């Protein structure tokens, strides 16, 4: 139900092929792309203000020395802690190769 012009109604909590209101994003934008945008924006812009609150909302805990890193290795560490090990590519090669 994620990809391909499917919209989400939180009132009915259901996925429709028609957009319920104007300026309503699709399910791939609202559920996948926008949290990725918010994660990268919170890392590269708000590394000291709202980053530990955002990491607590994602269930990600980092040490004090890990937050002292520069922005690219810290963002790599945050995405490695969030997404975990690489499993979608492995499942692609299992069920399509």
């Amino acid at each position: 139900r994620l990809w391909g012009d499917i919209y989400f109604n939180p009132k009915t909590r259901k996925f429709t092929k028609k957009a319920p209101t104007s300026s309503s994003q699709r399910s791939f934008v609202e559920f996948i792309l926008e949290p990725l945008y918010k994660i990268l924006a919170q890392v590269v812009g708000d590394v000291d203000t709202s980053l530990p609150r955002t990491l607590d909302e994602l269930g990600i805990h980092l040490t004090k020395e890990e937050l002292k890193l520069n922005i690219r290795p810290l963002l790599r560490l945050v995405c490695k802690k969030f997404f975990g090990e690489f499993t979608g590519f492995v499942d692609m090669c299992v069920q399509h190769i």
Binding site: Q25, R26, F28, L33, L36, Y37, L40, M92, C93, I97
Partner: protein, 49 residues
């Protein structure tokens, strides 16, 4: 073209999506449009070949 002509299974991964975010600063709907355009171009190339 060479993978179709060698008769192999073909899957596609889209690397460097952070260039849509950090580098290009696209809105996320336009990022979806770019990804769907990439997928449509690859499907058109496979259907042509």
């Amino acid at each position: 073209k060479h993978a179709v002509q060698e008769r192999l299974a073909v899957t596609v991964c889209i690397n460097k999506i952070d260039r849509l975010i950090l580098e290009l600063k696209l809105p996320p709907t336009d990022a979806y449009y770019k990804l769907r355009h990439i997928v449509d171009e690859v499907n058109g190339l496979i259907s042509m070949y």
